[PDB]
Symmetry: C4
Subunit: 209 residues, 4 copies
């Protein structure tokens, strides 16, 4: 019993996993090259199953070693799903290259120390969706009639507005043609770009605290 | 009188306000989809009048409870106007009725703080912003009598001189979209525009720092 | 001397100058509309001439009242030159609109704002000079690398400058410049991608240096 | 020991800066084709003198400094930029890097460099995350959109450039993401979150930089 617990939390075992991680990453970085998957595709498709096989064992062990304690450690928890994904018979399997974040304790803090920023802002983030929701409704029934590729859908109003938010081709690509049919659209968007922009500065400042 | 005053400042009423918001939001969030408004549009268009009816009441009561204190409290004040817009049957207002889904910010005491904590920046910046508009005004005049003769779509009007210059501020398509064609007729437009990008940029950065300190 | 000295330093006079500024400002904002200058050009073309006369007088008084003390006050200095520009009887005809900046000078609330931001400039001259050489070294490389086939972008050292600043600003840097370049010189992702890195990394750290 | 006194003189320190600015300015006309027509031969020789003379300073300082020399970064760097210049057209272009040595002689710049380079270590925990994050994502696209959009995502390396471009937000939507949505209408599930994480990272870098120095 306790004999197994010593194998898991050993430096050897953990270090061994991280080696396979770095390796299986390189394996997926050659599954891209058509030339490679031609000559060595057979070599790889099995080699991957070996890895996800070993990772199945470890995650099973990690469960028996931790029992109910396991499904409260996110990194440990997260690792579980990412293999289940890898189990299901194709692109989302590459998420298992995130365990290199989990398996390395130097990263876990960085992720957490940056997710620690998320809560002090959800009061702001939640506001935006409401702000976006009303506007996406306005546009889709304002400009949605003549510019449907941009505003034909409520959701389509989202993508264009978040783009205009990012300031990519907001003027030449969206606002200028809009102003050829609705010449006052410069009253809709110029403030919206200000309103949304004002948020970002005060956030950055609020976080430097 | 005071009997209603207990209903008004009840948590139910406070909680209730936030409820109707969410429904009319979702209801207006289906007033967008053409598909929905076919079978249930009339049922919906009336539901808004139902909504816009009830919303008349709250602001009526809340005023008598607050009297002159009401028309000095911003959050409550705002609440009123959004109904008058919603009250008017120039369709635009029928579209502008959708602002009534903004009141969910007012009723939530967690939100007002969020809003308030950001407006405190304007006074430490109103000294700057007013400078910016003046800066634009002097410059917007320069272009309109410089490039306005051959580029009327971009600089033909002062208002168009504004829009084009305010765009270059954002750096969106400023070079290939604006300055490069300018340099085909007036090869020095980079003397107008390259510095203008500096000052305008330094202001906004120096503004952020002024906010970073406070 | 002392007889005039009471007119100069009055609050009234200060208030009076700012009136013509705001007046000449809004007045200068309609000299753009072609329609007006036909029906009202004489009213306007002269009103400018009226003002620039008065400001010539004031600047004469302000000089004699302060004498050598005048030519050490920045705000005072600028105001003078902007009238000299305005004095010359077609580029300058546009540069006359700079006289709408004196509203910054006459208002003591502005002078602080401008200066307190020019007060940041010295703490950055150590940084800025590095970039120019960095910019200068690179413009030489491109102009003799890609300048042969891309003359609109890199035919001249100065043209390499404009492209680099433009690339530095991130406007159409990739699709407009780097992508077509990589169709003839497939390694242009080695020239510019670092230039985007170094230049960008500086600006963040600079704001931080000021923050 | 006779030469050693010349090197660390204030004259000599200043003296290097003379040839830099001159060779810098001289290369600013080796660039202009117009000048190099009438003065090219006049120009081509001045460089060889400099690239010869510039060898000496780094030669002397080494015997003066010995093993102390190859532990001072600025001292180290100075050599390679000359060694590059020595090898007899990319190299002929890379010779112009020799105008960087002006950084060595001037102590006012190094402080900015050092005081800024200092904020690069406390973040490598973040940057390496980004490279991995890009790596996972660059793989996803390249086998997602690589089939129909190869100039943008046909190769992992091409996914890099396209993703690093979208990071800067240059023509990411109209130029890259919007056409993607005509065949794969779900590319906004790949790209919209990717836009969030990468952006949030850059902010957090700032926070780390705000605090550090
Ligand atoms: O703002 C950004 N671009 C818009 C501005 C900048 C100038 C061009 C157009 N205007 C921006 C740029 C970034 O480049 C990161 C680097 F690639 F350098 F690493 C990262 C995050 C950004 O922020 C996005 C936000 F905040 F706008 F949403």
């Amino acid at each position: 019993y306790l004999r197994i617990t010593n194998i898991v939390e050993s430096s050897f075992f953990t270090k061994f996993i991280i080696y396979l991680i770095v390796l299986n990453g390189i394996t997926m970085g050659l599954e891209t090259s058509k030339t490679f998957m031609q000559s060595f595709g057979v070599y790889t498709t099995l080699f991957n199953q070996i890895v996800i096989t070993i990772f199945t064992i470890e995650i099973i062990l990690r469960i028996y070693v931790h029992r109910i304690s396991f499904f409260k450690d996110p990194w440990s928890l997260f690792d579980f799903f990412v293999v289940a994904i890898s189990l299901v018979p194709r692109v989302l399997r590459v998420l298992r290259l995130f365990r290199l974040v989990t398996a390395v304790p130097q990263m876990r803090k960085i992720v957490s120390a940056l997710i620690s920023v998320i809560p002090g802002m959800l009061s702001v983030i939640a506001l935006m969706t409401l702000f976006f929701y009303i506007f996406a409704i306005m546009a889709t029934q304002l400009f949605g009639e003549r510019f449907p590729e941009w505003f034909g859908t409520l959701g389509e109003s989202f993508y264009t507005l978040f783009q205009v938010m990012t300031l990519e081709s907001w003027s030449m690509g969206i606002v200028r043609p809009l102003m050829e049919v609705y010449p006052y659209a410069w009253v809709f968007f110029i403030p919206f770009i200000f309103v949304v922009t004002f948020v970002m500065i005060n956030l950055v400042v609020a976080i430097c605290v």
